[PDB]
Paper text:
The catalytic activity of thrombin and other enzymes of the blood coagulation and complement cascades is enhanced significantly by binding of Na+ to a site >15 Å away from the catalytic residue S195, buried within the 180 and 220 loops that also contribute to the primary specificity of the enzyme. Binding of Na+ to thrombin takes place within a buried site defined by the 180 and 220 loops and located >15 Å away from residues of the catalytic triad. Rapid kinetics support a binding mechanism of conformational selection where the Na+-binding site is in equilibrium between open (N) and closed (N∗) forms and the cation binds selectively to the N form. Molecular details on how Na+ gains access to this site and communicates allosterically with the active site remain poorly defined.
The crystal structure of thrombin in the E form reveals an intriguing pore defined by the adjacent 180 and 220 loops that could function as a gate to the Na+ site. However, this point of entry to the Na+ site would make thrombin unique among all Na+-activated proteases of the trypsin family because none of them, including factor Xa and activated protein C, possess such a pore. Swapping the entire 184a to 188 and 221 to 224 sequences of the 180 and 220 loops between thrombin (184aYKPDEGKRG188 and 221DRDGK224) and activated protein C (184aILGDRQ188 and 221GLLHN224) produces a thrombin mutant, Thrombin180/220, that is expected to lack the pore. Indeed, the crystal structure of Thrombin180/220 solved at 2.1 Å resolution shows that the pore is occluded. The mutant features only a rapid jump in fluorescence when Na+ binding is studied by stopped flow (data not shown), without the second slow relaxation observed in the wild-type. The rapid jump is not consistent with loss of Na+ binding. In fact, the mutant shows enhanced M+ activation and a shift of the M+ specificity from Na+ to K+. These structural and functional findings rule out the pore being a gate to the Na+ binding site. Replacing the entire 180 and 220 loops of thrombin with those of activated protein C also produces a mutant that retains M+ activation even though the pore is no longer present.
Numbering used by the authors:
A (entry chain A): 1G, 1F, 1E, 1D, 1C, 1B, 1A, 1 to 14, ...
B (entry chain B): 16 to 36, 36A, 37 to 60, 60A, 60B, 60C, 60D, 60E, ...
């Protein structure tokens, strides 16, 4: 596979800095309101 | 992408641009799944009805990019391909069933603030997240305005585009198209809304952020649409978890 697996999916400029992007809230809202 | 918006810097650091050497053109999107492996749609590499059948020598992937056209010195990395792997039961003749392909980089890429791999779903993540009404996110450099007669769209973006779209119920997907849909596909979009991924977005990722561990998971690959950005239908996506055993097979071997 090579490196990447353990640290996958965590963005250096967002998750790793406890910063959220401008529209990820919409994704989380859809989990609670979408069904 | 129709009716999306500009990606933020580093918003999608797994986004890969599949690029044609000669002539120089954007071909497709793709995704970075490790320092070595890139995931895309089979139809971006092989589609006989369009005289498409690319060797490894024809293409180069560009990683870490934001601008569609500008060389992003010391940010973007340009990698050449060792080997292409197309799903052996890929069905281009009928419906694009199993529209998945892997590319092995000749040389592992270095991760940075702008380059980082996306996660692949396991079974639990797929059972939790891939449900009708839940939204994932698509990104790409595909065209911006709706087209009826082709999935290309019109108008090229200057910067990577992003749009969030909800997963649609399987019976609804099926009623929305005369093309036979399979368990290896799912569809996404809002009826009455133009938000859509176009042809130039093909091969790029449909990703979801897990509410449990904050990691982003690639649930789909932009596979096909009838038109782009139309009000009456949805776009179709390769179901990545359902083809995960093939992915793991290729990687292990
Ligand atoms: C693609 O590459 C060449 C044709 O020029 C040949 O090795 C192979 O059979 C081709 N495959 C398809 C699907 O045309």
């Amino acid at each position: 596979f090579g490196s990447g697996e353990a640290d996958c999916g965590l963005r250096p400029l967002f998750e790793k800095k406890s910063l959220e992007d401008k529209t990820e809230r919409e994704l989380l809202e859809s989990y609670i309101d979408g069904r | 992408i129709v009716e999306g918006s500009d990606a933020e810097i580093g918003m999608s650091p797994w986004q890969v641009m599949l690029f044609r050497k000669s002539p120089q053109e954007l071909l497709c999107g793709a995704s970075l799944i490790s320092d070595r492996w890139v995931l895309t749609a089979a139809h971006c590499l092989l589609y006989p009805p369009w005289d498409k059948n690319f060797t490894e020598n024809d293409l180069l992937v560009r990683i870490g990019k934001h601008s569609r056209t500008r060389y992003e010195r010391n940010i973007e990395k340009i990698s050449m391909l060792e080997k292409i792997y197309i799903h052996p039961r890929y069905n281009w003749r009928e419906n694009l069933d199993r529209d998945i392909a892997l590319m092995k980089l000749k040389k592992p890429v270095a991760f940075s603030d702008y380059i980082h791999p996306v996660c692949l779903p396991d079974r639990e993540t797929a059972a939790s997240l891939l449900q009708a009404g839940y939204k994932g996110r698509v990104t790409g450099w595909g065209n911006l305005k709706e087209t009826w007669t082709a999935n290309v769209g019109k108008g090229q973006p200057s910067v990577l585009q992003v749009v969030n779209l909800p997963i649609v119920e399987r019976p609804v997907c099926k009623d929305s198209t005369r093309i036979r849909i399979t368990d290896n596909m799912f569809c996404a979009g809002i009826l009455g809304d133009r938000q859509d991924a176009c042809e130039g977005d093909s091969g790029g990722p449909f990703v979801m952020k897990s509410p449990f561990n904050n990691r982003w998971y690639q649930m789909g690959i932009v596979s096909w649409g009838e038109g782009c950005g139309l009000l009456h239908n949805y776009g179709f996506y390769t179901h990545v978890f359902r083809l995960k055993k093939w992915i793991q097979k290729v990687i292990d071997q």
